[PDB]
Every structure is written in structure tokens, then in C-alpha cells.
Amino acid sequence: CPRFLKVKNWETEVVLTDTLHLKSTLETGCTEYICMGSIMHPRPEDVATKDQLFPLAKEFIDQYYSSIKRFGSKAHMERLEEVNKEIDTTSTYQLKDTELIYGAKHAWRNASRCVGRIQWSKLQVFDARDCTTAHGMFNYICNHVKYATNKGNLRSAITIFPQRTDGKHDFRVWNSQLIRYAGYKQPDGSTLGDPANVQFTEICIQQGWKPPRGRFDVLPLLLQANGNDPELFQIPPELVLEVPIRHPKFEWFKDLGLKWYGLPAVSNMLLEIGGLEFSACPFSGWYMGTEIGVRDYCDNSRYNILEEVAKKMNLDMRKTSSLWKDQALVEINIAVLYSFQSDKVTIVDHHSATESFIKHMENEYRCRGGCPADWVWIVPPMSGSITPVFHQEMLNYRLTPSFEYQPDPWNTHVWK
Amino acid sequence: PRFLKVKNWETEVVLTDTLHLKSTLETGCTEYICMGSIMHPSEDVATKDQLFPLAKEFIDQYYSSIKRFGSKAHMERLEEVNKEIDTTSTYQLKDTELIYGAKHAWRNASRCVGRIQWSKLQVFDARDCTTAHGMFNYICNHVKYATNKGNLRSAITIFPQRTDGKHDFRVWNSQLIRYAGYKQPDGSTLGDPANVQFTEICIQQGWKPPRGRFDVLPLLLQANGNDPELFQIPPELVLEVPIRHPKFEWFKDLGLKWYGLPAVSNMLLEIGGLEFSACPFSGWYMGTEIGVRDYCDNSRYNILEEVAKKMNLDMRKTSSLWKDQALVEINIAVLYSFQSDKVTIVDHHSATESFIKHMENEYRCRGGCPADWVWIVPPMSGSITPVFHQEMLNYRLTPSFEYQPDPWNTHVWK
Numbered sequence: 033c034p035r036f037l038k039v040k041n042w043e044t045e046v047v048l049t050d051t052l053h054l055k056s057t058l059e060t061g062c063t064e065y066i067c068m069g070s071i072m073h074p075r076p077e078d079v080a081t082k083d084q085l086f087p088l089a090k091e092f093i094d095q096y097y098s099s100i101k102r103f104g105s106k107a108h109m110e111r112l113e114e115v116n117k118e119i120d121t122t123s124t125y126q127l128k129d130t131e132l133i134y135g136a137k138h139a140w141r142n143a144s145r146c147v148g149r150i151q152w153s154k155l156q157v158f159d160a161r162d163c164t165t166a167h168g169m170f171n172y173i174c175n176h177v178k179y180a181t182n183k184g185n186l187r188s189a190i191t192i193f194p195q196r197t198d199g200k201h202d203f204r205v206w207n208s209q210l211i212r213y214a215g216y217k218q219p220d221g222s223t224l225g226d227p228a229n230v231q232f233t234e235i236c237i238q239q240g241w242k243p244p245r246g247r248f249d250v251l252p253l254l255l256q257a258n259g260n261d262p263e264l265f266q267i268p269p270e271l272v273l274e275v276p277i278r279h280p281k282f283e284w285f286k287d288l289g290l291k292w293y294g295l296p297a298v299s300n301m302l303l304e305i306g307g308l309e310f311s312a313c314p315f316s317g318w319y320m321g322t323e324i325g326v327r328d329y330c331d332n333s334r335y336n337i338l339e340e341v342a343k344k345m346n347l348d349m350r351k352t353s354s355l356w357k358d359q360a361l362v363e364i365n366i367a368v369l370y371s372f373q374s375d376k377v378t379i380v381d382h383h384s385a386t387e388s389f390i391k392h393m394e395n396e397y398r399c400r401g402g403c404p405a406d407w408v409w410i411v412p413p414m415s416g417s418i419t420p421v422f423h424q425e426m427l428n429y430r431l432t433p434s435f436e437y438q439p440d441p442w443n444t445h446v447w448k
Numbered sequence: 449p450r451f452l453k454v455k456n457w458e459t460e461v462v463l464t465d466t467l468h469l470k471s472t473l474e475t476g477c478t479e480y481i482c483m484g485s486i487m488h489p490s491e492d493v494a495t496k497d498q499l500f501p502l503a504k505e506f507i508d509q510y511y512s513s514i515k516r517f518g519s520k521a522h523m524e525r526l527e528e529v530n531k532e533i534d535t536t537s538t539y540q541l542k543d544t545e546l547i548y549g550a551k552h553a554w555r556n557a558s559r560c561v562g563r564i565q566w567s568k569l570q571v572f573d574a575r576d577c578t579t580a581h582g583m584f585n586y587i588c589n590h591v592k593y594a595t596n597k598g599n600l601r602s603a604i605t606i607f608p609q610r611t612d613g614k615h616d617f618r619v620w621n622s623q624l625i626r627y628a629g630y631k632q633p634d635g636s637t638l639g640d641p642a643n644v645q646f647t648e649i650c651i652q653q654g655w656k657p658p659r660g661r662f663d664v665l666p667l668l669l670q671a672n673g674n675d676p677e678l679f680q681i682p683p684e685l686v687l688e689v690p691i692r693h694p695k696f697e698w699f700k701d702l703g704l705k706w707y708g709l710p711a712v713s714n715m716l717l718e719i720g721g722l723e724f725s726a727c728p729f730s731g732w733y734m735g736t737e738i739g740v741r742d743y744c745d746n747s748r749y750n751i752l753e754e755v756a757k758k759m760n761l762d763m764r765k766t767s768s769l770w771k772d773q774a775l776v777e778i779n780i781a782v783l784y785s786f787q788s789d790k791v792t793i794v795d796h797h798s799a800t801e802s803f804i805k806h807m808e809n810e811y812r813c814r815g816g817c818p819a820d821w822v823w824i825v826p827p828m829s830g831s832i833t834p835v836f837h838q839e840m841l842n843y844r845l846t847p848s849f850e851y852q853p854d855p856w857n858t859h860v861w862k
């Protein structure tokens with residue numbers, strides 16, 4: 033393999049040189065003869081073995097002591113020695129608080145699909161490795177939401193639950209996000225609420241939830257601790273900051289009755305640090321406008337409001353070449369940004385966000401020797417070519433520590 | 449080495465890809481690093497040794513395509529190409545193979561959203577051409593046929609293959625019809641900034657520039673490795689659309705216009721090991737190629753500020769989405785203008801819809817369709833088109849269109 037890789041920005045002619053790719057660890061799914069960069073996901077009861085774990089822990093501990101300019105120190109060699117002994121006598125090991133914090137920050141720093149990574153170093157890490165029950169999971173998660181929401185001045189956070197052991201005692205948040213809206217399939221095939229969450233809502237309802245059956249019902253937390261069956265918990269509604277969507281120029285836009293929650297918090301991913309697997313690690317930041325305005329509101333298999341918005345704009349909807357869809361999508365995304373800003377809820381438009389990412393990516397090349405980025409995800413779902421990332425060549429590779437996907441818990445859980 | 453599935457996440461349609469098992473050119477990716485966003489991922493004169501397998505493979509898929517694999521014609525066409533590579537170090541394609549080759553290079557073009565049309569391709573054989581005047585003649589016939597008074601038709605003209613690398617046929621323009629770009633004394637750029645260097649090459653070669661904003665560049669034609677020569681396309685062959693908006697009547701005051709015929713002239717057509725370094729090909733525009741990229745790139749006409757100015761939009765903050773609002777209007781005007789002048793154009797909703805249908809077809813009858821998501825997804829309104837939620841496998845099939853160095857970096861004058 034080659035030691036230097038060049039990427040070019042075709043708008044500004046800047047050429048950057050990647051050496052960091054040499055440290056990539058996992059497979060991309062691509063080979064010499066096929067590229068899978070547009071594939072979304074290129075037994076979970078199986079856990080790492082002693083001999084698998086020794087080099088994974090050593091690699092991470094080396095990286096950690098290199099970051100603190102203590103590589104090869106006495107502290108470093110004693111840490112290696114200590115971790116090798118735990119793995120030998122228990123087939124696992126425990127991270128120090130400082131290592132858990134470094135690893136989490138670096139999982140975000142390595143997240144090739146995240147346009148927000150300029151902020152990676154500023155991440156509040158909540159250590160919840162002492163949790164044993166689902167009530168305690170709920171307690172930890174409520175503090176996360178409250179801290180991260182911060183009355184509208186959102187702060188990025190992660191809460192980390194105990195690592196996997198034998199695979200039969202996993203902690204999971206069954207929710208895909210801490211805060212989502214319920215989706216109710218109707219007898220007539222229509223959908224009330226959020227179509228993306230129909231399946232999860234049926235699971236909550238089965239487990240005992242009484243749904244209000246409205247358009248914006250915050251789902252309950254479904255929490256699994258130490259491998260037990262999950263348990264329901266209603267987030268205190270005063271902890272769920274919401275934003276009603278109105279438009280600066282169109283008086284009627286509030287009449288759609290749209291609102292959205294302020295805190296995007298992914299809760300279904302796996303955090304891998306030095307070969308340890310933290311199956312429950314909800315993390316939160318703040319929204320880029322387009323995630324709400326374009327996808328959540330205008331995807332066909334979502335709230336699907338372009339039609340109704342276009343009707344109220346009186347657009348010719350008979351032919352596609354009028355571009356009525358594109359015209360309504362922009363107004364929708366103006367109303368989303370206008371609403372969050374009026375209510376002083378942190379949010380970022382796709383211009384500012386991509387602009388920050390280019391600056392971040394250049395800094396990482398300069399100071400770190402590269403910045404893995406997944407162009408298919410970094411480029412916003414609207415107005416792509418008028419943002420700087422569109423013209424930026426990117427290298428995509430998997431560095432550890434990292435956030436990974438994992439199967440849905442209802443597909444694997446053994447019921448007590 | 450398996451059948452691979454691709455999922456559409458809107459419709460949940462899953463297609464199974466076997467065609468990739470037949471590819472042999474490289475993508476640029478590795479198990480550890482993906483280069484799906486590198487534009488040109490990573491001398492060229494092959495010898496007899498490399499040439500016969502490539503040729504044998506191409507004849508194989510040709511006779512396979514016409515339901516006569518392993519026939520007498522197939523046996524004999526193999527030995528004819530064998531003898532010919534043997535003695536002359538190259539070989540000549542039949543007319544049928546040439547047509548089949550050009551159509552399948554289009555069909556194999558991962559970056560092209562317009563491939564549902566791939567087999568309606570008019571192939572002009574120009575392999576008898578020897579001079580730049582002959583090139584100019586074949587190019588004028590191409591432009592006249594493909595334009596067709598507005599009802600455009602897909603066409604490719606194929607000049608002689610590369611031989612020793614010293615006698616290359618090259619069209620120095622990147623497209624047959626483009627506007628010129630001028631560096632100003634005050635620093636700015638008049639016309640099209642992407643063509644500033646090529647415009648100076650033409651001026652240096654004797655061209656007298658009008659120094660307007662939409663000046664059609666002359667053809668610069670290189671035949672058999674000689675110095676390129678300048679030719680003016682007859683203006684009556686150059687169809688142009690003045691851009692006006694159906695709601696904003698001030699839009700015509702902008703004085704914008706574009707040409708009707710997109711005709712890529714700087715690529716290399718590779719068929720069965722043969723290199724056609726001159727093969728201008730043309731179809732018709734997707735509205736966004738003009739209205740998003742040509743007019744609204746920073747490194748191009750960069751007209752967004754002017755438009756949102758006349759729309760009287762709040763341009764202080766980025767979060768008013770004033771760029772995005774002006775972009776849709778510009779792209780309505782392009783589509784409105786072309787349709788009103790009855791020049792063939794497709795909008796990015798209809799084209800991506802067609803490409804999905806094309807994909808279904810190719811998976812049905814061919815077992816796959818190589819597709820470059822990065823290039824297939826339109827440069828605006830991405831996720832409200834069907835291709836955004838379409839998984840695509842990218843892989844390199846031949847015959848194919850490849851990039852080649854710009855001639856002014858390679859050519860040795862005299």
C-alpha cells in the first residue's frame with residue numbers, strides 16, 4: 033500500500049496529503065474491483081477472546097499514551113502490564129476514567145459520517161459503568177438530557193453504560209434515539225405520526241405503553257440492563273425541549289401544526305474502545321437544519337409534507353419541471369431554521385456546518401495527518417453543490433476507537 | 449465473490465448484482481480505504497502482448513451479445529484479430545463491433561444518469577480521417593445531426609485509434625461548444641472561468657476573441673499528432689437558448705444564455721484494447737448541469753449573488769437560505785427557457801426517476817448496472833430524488849470512457 037494519499041478540492045485547488053489512513057483497522061466493504069461507498073451497512077452473542085483482545089487493548093493504550101506525550105514512559109509500560117494481567121485472569125479489562133474519556137472523544141473524532149466533528153474535543157462524557165438496573169439507566173439518561181438540553185443552549189454529551197461481558201448481559205437502549213415521535217399504522221394503511229418509528233412504537237405498545245395516538249407523541253424509553261428484559265419509562269415532558277415550526281414570511285405555516293424536538297440523541301450504536309464493546313452509549317449534539325427540514329419532514333417514508341406545503345404556496349404541482357418540490361423544500365427549511373433561532377435553540381444551517389467541516393478537515397490533515405470522511409453522508413441532502421464539501425475529495429477509512437452499528441435488540445434478545 | 453444486494457431505502461426494493469463478477473479494471477478502493485469521492489482515482493501505449501487478451505475478451509462479449517458465442521464467425525474473427533495484432537501490432541474493429549463498443553461504453557458509464565437511452569446512440573465512424581480539416585468536417589456533421597433544430601439526438605464520432613502515441617488524434621476543447629473565459633486586468637473573469645486557460649491557448653494560436661460574456665470558442669483540432677488547427681463552427685449550427693424566468697420578468701435583464709448541445713470531447717474511448725483518444729459524444733442536458741453547476745459554482749459564472757439581489761432577499765446571514773432560494777429560481781428559468789424554445793432538456797426529477805427504471809431493467813436482463821452514487825445524485829435537491837435512497841455498486845466494465853491527459857501538457861510542437 034502507498035504511504036501518502038492526496039485529496040483535492042476542485043473549487044479552491046487545495047491539495048491535502050493523508051498519512052493517517054495507514055492506521056486504519058477495519059474493513060470498508062470495498063475491494064480493488066468494487067466500491068460500496070453508497071451502501072448503508074457494508075452473532076452479537078459472540079465476544080472477543082483473550083488472544084483477540086491483547087493486541088486491541090495494546091494498540092489503544094499505545095495510542096492513548098502517545099496522545100499525552102508519555103509514550104514509552106514508566107506509566108505507559110505499567111499500564112500495559114496491568115491490562116495484560118486483567119485480560120489474562122478475567123478475559124477482559126477495565127478502562128481508566130481518562131482512557132474512557134479519550135476513547136469516546138476519539139470515536140466521535142473518527143466518525144467518518146459526521147459533519148459536526150469540529151466540536152469533537154468539547155464533549156461531556158458521563159461515566160455510567162456503575163449502573164446495574166434499568167431504573168438507573170433511566171436516571172442517568174434523564175441527567176444527560178437535562179445537561180445536554182441546557183434550556184436551549186445545547187451541549188454535546190455521551191453517557192456510557194457497562195461494557196459487554198459474555199454477551200448475555202448487555203445493556204441496550206432499545207430506542208434508536210432518546211427522543212423520537214411515535215408512529216401508528218392505521219387499519220386503512222395510512223400512518224399517524226412518524227412512519228420511521230412504527231415498528232418500535234408497536235413494541236412499546238406491546239410492552240405496556242398506553243399511546244395518546246397523536247401526531248407528536250414522545251416515545252417512552254425502553255431500557256435493558258445486564259441482559260434483563262427491557263423496561264418502559266416516560267421521559268419527564270419538561271425535559272423534552274420542543275420547537276413549534278413557523279415561517280418568517282408565510283403566516284399560514286404555523287397552521288400546519290408542526291413541531292420538532294430540540295435534542296438529537298442517537299442511542300442504538302456501539303462504542304468500541306480498545307476492543308471493549310459498550311452496547312449502550314447514547315450521545316447527543318445539536319441539529320443541522322436539513323436533518324429536520326429535508327429528511328424528517330420531506331422524505332416520502334416520513335412526515336411527507338411537501339405536498340401540503342406546496343398546496344399552501346399555490347405551486348403548479350402537475351409537472352415536475354416547475355420544481356415545486358424544490359421550492360417548497362427550501363421554505364420548509366427556512367421555517368425550521370427560523371423557529372429554532374427564534375426560540376434560541378442551538379441549530380446550524382448546512383452552509384455554516386459544511387464550512388466548519390472543511391476548516392476542521394484541513395486542521396486534522398495538518399495536525400493529525402488525515403481526516404476520514406464519508407462524502408455520501410457529509411454532503412447535505414439539499415443544495416449539495418453550493419456547499420464546500422461537495423467539491424472536496426475525501427478518503428473514507430475506519431479508525432478505532434469508533435461508533436459502530438449493531439443489530440436491533442428485539443431481533444436477538446433472549447426473553448426471561 | 450458473491451451475489452451482492454443493493455437496497456432502495458424508500459421503496460425497500462432489493463436488487464441482486466451478479467454483473468460485478470465480470471469486471472477486471474480497478475476502482476481505486478481497497479479493503480481499508482474507499483476512494484468513492486476521488487474524481488480521477490488512480491505514457492499509455494499498450495503492446496501486442498497486452499493487446500490480444502483485451503481484444504479476445506471484447507470479441508467474446510460481442511459474439512456472446514449476438515447469440516453466436518463459439519460459432520464459426522467467432523472462431524474466425526478471433527484468428528483474424530490474432531493474425532492482425534501479430535503482424536501490425538494492432539487491429540481494426542469491424543463496423544458492427546465499433547457500434548457495439550461505443551454503445552456499451554455508454555452503458556458501462558457509472559457516472560452517467562442518462563443511460564436509459566444507451567442503445568439509441570448514433571455512431572459516426574470517422575476512422576478514415578487524416579487531417580484537422582477532415583476532423584472539422586466530421587464534427588460539423590455531428591453537431592448538425594445531434595442538434596436537429598432542437599429535438600436533440602445522441603451521437604458519437606470516433607476518430608482513428610492511437611497507434612504509437614506520437615500520432616494521436618485529439619480535440620483540444622473539453623466540449624465541442626463552450627463559452628470562453630477572460631482574465632481581466634482588474635482581476636475578475638469575463639465569461640466562463642473554467643475555460644480561461646484554453647481560451648488563452650486559442651488566442652495564442654491566432655484566435656480573435658470578441659471578449660464578450662458568451663463567446664463560442666473555436667474548435668482546436670489535432671490530427672495524427674500534428675500541431676492543432678483552429679476552426680470556427682458555423683454559427684447557424686450553434687443552437688442557443690436565452691434564459692428567462694416564467695414569473696420574474698427582470699430575469700431576462702440578466703442577459704444569460706446557454707447552448708443546447710452538451711458534447712464531451714476530451715475523453716478516451718477504450719474498446720477491446722484499442723484507444724480512441726478523439727471521440728466527441730453528445731446527448732442533451734439535465735437542467736441542473738447548467739442551472740446549478742455552470743451558473744452557480746464559485747469557480748464558474750457565480751451568478752447567485754446577482755439573482756438573490758434582484759429577488760430582494762436577506763443576504764446578511766447564511767441561515768436565511770438565500771443561496772438555496774435563488775438556486776431553485778435559476779433552475780426553474782433554465783427548464784422554462786429550454787422547454788419554451790422546444791430544445792430537448794430533462795429535469796433532475798424525471799432523469800433520476802428514469803435512471804431508477806433503467807437500473808431495474810439492467811438488473812433484470814444483465815445482472816447489474818455500475819453506478820457512481822456521488823455523480824448520479826443531482827447537485828441540488830438530492831434526497832427528494834429517488835436515487836438518493838438508492839444503494840449503488842460501482843465497478844469498472846469495459847468498453848469504457850476514460851480520462852486522458854490534457855493535450856497541452858503532452859504535445860511536443862514543431
Ligand code: HEM
Pocket residue numbers: 136139140143145146147148149151155188189190315316317318319320323380385409435
Ligand atoms: C455537535 C453537533 C453535531 C452535529 C451538527 C452533527 C451532525 C451530524 C449529521 C448531520 C450526521 C448525519 C446524520 C444523518 O443524516 O442521519 C451525523 C452523523 C453522525 N454523528 Fe454527528 N453531529 C453532531 C454531534 C455528534 C456527536 C456528539 C457524536 C458522538 C459523540 C456524533 C457522532 C456521529 C456518528 C457516529 C454519526 C453516524 C451516524 C450513523 O451512521 O447513523 N455526532 N452527525
Ligand code: HEM
Pocket residue numbers: 554557559560561562563565569602603604729730731732733734737794799823849
Ligand atoms: C442523452 C442524454 C444524457 C443525459 C441527460 C446525461 C446526463 C449526464 C450527467 C448529468 C452526467 C454528469 C455530468 C457532469 O456532471 O459532468 C453525465 C456523465 C457522463 N455521461 Fe451522460 N448524459 C446523456 C448522454 C450521454 C451520452 C450520449 C454519453 C456517451 C456516448 C454519455 C456518457 C457519459 C459519461 C462518460 C459521463 C462521465 C463524465 C465524466 O466522468 O466526466 N452520456 N451524463
Ligand SMILES: CCO[C@@H]1C[C@H](CCc2cc(F)c(F)c(CCc3cc(C)cc(N)n3)c2)N(C)C1
Pocket residue numbers: 209228296297298315316317318319320323324327328331333334
Ligand atoms: C428513514 C427515513 O429518513 C431517515 C431520517 C434520518 C434523517 C437524518 C437524521 C434525522 C434525525 F431526526 C436525527 F435525530 C438524526 C441523528 C443524527 C445526529 C446525531 C447527532 C449526535 C447529532 C446530530 N445533529 N444528528 C439524523 N436519516 C438517517 C434517514
Ligand SMILES: CCO[C@@H]1C[C@H](CCc2cc(F)c(F)c(CCc3cc(C)cc(N)n3)c2)N(C)C1
Pocket residue numbers: 042623710711712729730731732733734737738741742745
Ligand atoms: C470543476 C467543477 O465544476 C465542473 C462543472 C461541471 C458541470 C456539469 C456539466 C456541465 C456542462 F455544461 C456539461 F456540458 C457537462 C457535460 C456532461 C454531459 C455529457 C453528455 C454526453 C450529456 C450531458 N447531458 N452532459 C457537464 N462539472 C463536471 C464540474
Ligand SMILES: C[C@H](O)[C@H](O)[C@H]1CNc2nc(N)[nH]c(=O)c2N1
Pocket residue numbers: 042422423424425426484485486487822823824
Ligand atoms: C470531490 C467530488 O468527487 C467532485 O466534486 C464531484 C462530486 N460529484 C459530482 N457529480 C457530478 N455529477 N459531477 C461532478 O463534477 C461532481 N464532482
Ligand SMILES: C[C@H](O)[C@H](O)[C@H]1CNc2nc(N)[nH]c(=O)c2N1
Pocket residue numbers: 069070071072408409410457836837838839840
Ligand atoms: C443509498 C444511500 O447510501 C443512503 O440513502 C444514504 C445517502 N446519504 C445519507 N446521508 C446522510 N447524512 N444520512 C443518510 O441517511 C443518508 N442516506
Ligand SMILES: [Zn+2]
Pocket residue numbers: 062066067068069477481482483484
Ligand atoms: Zn469505495
